[PDB]
Design a protein around this ligand. Sequence first.
Ligand code: COA
Ligand code: COA
Lengths: 182, 182
Amino acid sequence: GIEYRSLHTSQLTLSEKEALYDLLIEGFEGDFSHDDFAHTLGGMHVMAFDQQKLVGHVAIIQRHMALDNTPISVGYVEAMVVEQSYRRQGIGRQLMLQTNKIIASCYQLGLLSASDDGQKLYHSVGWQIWKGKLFELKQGSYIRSIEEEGGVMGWKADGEVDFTASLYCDFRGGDQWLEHHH
Amino acid sequence: GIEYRSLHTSQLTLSEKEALYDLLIEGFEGDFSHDDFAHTLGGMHVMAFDQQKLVGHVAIIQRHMALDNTPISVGYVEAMVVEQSYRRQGIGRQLMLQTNKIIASCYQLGLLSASDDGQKLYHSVGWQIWKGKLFELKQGSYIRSIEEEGGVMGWKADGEVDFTASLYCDFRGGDQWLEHHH
Ligand SMILES: CC(C)(COP(=O)(O)OP(=O)(O)OC[C@H]1O[C@@H](n2cnc3c(N)ncnc32)[C@H](O)[C@@H]1OP(=O)(O)O)[C@@H](O)C(=O)NCCC(=O)NCCS
Ligand SMILES: CC(C)(COP(=O)(O)OP(=O)(O)OC[C@H]1O[C@@H](n2cnc3c(N)ncnc32)[C@H](O)[C@@H]1OP(=O)(O)O)[C@@H](O)C(=O)NCCC(=O)NCCS
């Protein structure tokens, strides 16, 4: 069947990294830059394989944030993709359940960014919309990230996380702006 | 001989985590709290083993910082320890060389905190004192971390890192203060 392996970036072979880049480009329909690839590296990769062949991926990146004024360790989930011909068979769900187990063993909180349609998969494995305010650094000072509110979901490993509290994010750059649409 | 394995926190067994806690407490001479242990978890552990037995460790934690106003991905090295009876045989050095290879495959910059005596080991494997200013968040705003300047060393994976530039750190809490000594 499908076999799942969880590997840190440092544990990947060159072959596996090239196959990951291929899966990401194709699965994101060519909207996937060198910075987006760099942005996926440095943490854990949960990967699905059909015999030797990479067919699914999600990354978990460690981030260090503040919940109101208290430090909180975050596992930040990104770059979820399943090869188009392998979709709608539960691989995405399995990737997320493995991801939840990593978060539970390692971090206080899981966070991710999803579109409205995108959210159902995550919600089926326990994720919930973050209700509180979000803040990001802009030219060295915190400013509320209205854009992103409602698009961020979380998953509670540390039972004392208030999803209505304010999160103050670490800097990850990647053009941040508030959309205004008439 | 000594065998080296690099494992993410999520890949450790319960036995291995308990042995890691034991090594850390003993190797840090009982100055090692639950928060200090939590602070070591969530990234990579480079570990040295004598047959089945854990004898050395160092952790690499992903951090996301700003170099002046540009994002920089950091591998933050912490919790280096070798069992006292195994010291002065090159295990510490080997742990650091494995650590440097992780940094080179994953991050733009390695950073760590060392005492004056502590620095020689790191300097023997290419690390250098960060010369620029350091900034940390305090009640939500950046303030210069004078305390820490001179105690932080870096190791350049991304050849365009200016060690005289200002680093703006992510929040990791753990009582921050400037010492004043007469
Ligand atoms: C999002 C994505 C990873 C989902 O992967 P997947 O393997 O198809 O996910 P799953 O199969 O677990 O779940 C997908 C859907 O198939 C349905 N499904 C899963 N297994 C099934 C089975 N045996 N029979 C019928 N339906 C099934 C699920 O019900 C889920 O429901 P939905 O139609 O209501 O959305 C995939 O569509 C993808 O790679 N998209 C492009 C990249 C992307 O947008 N990624 C997210 C970035 S945040
Ligand atoms: C710091 C520490 C990890 C070093 O581990 P180690 O395995 O002894 O390190 P190494 O053997 O690679 O290097 C240590 C010294 O032994 C010397 N040495 C290494 N191999 C040798 C050999 N075969 N023969 C003689 N000397 C040797 C090295 O020259 C180095 O030089 P130094 O005396 O000038 O400092 C260890 O002392 C320790 O665990 N300390 C307590 C925890 C701590 O303070 N950690 C750092 C937190 S930032």
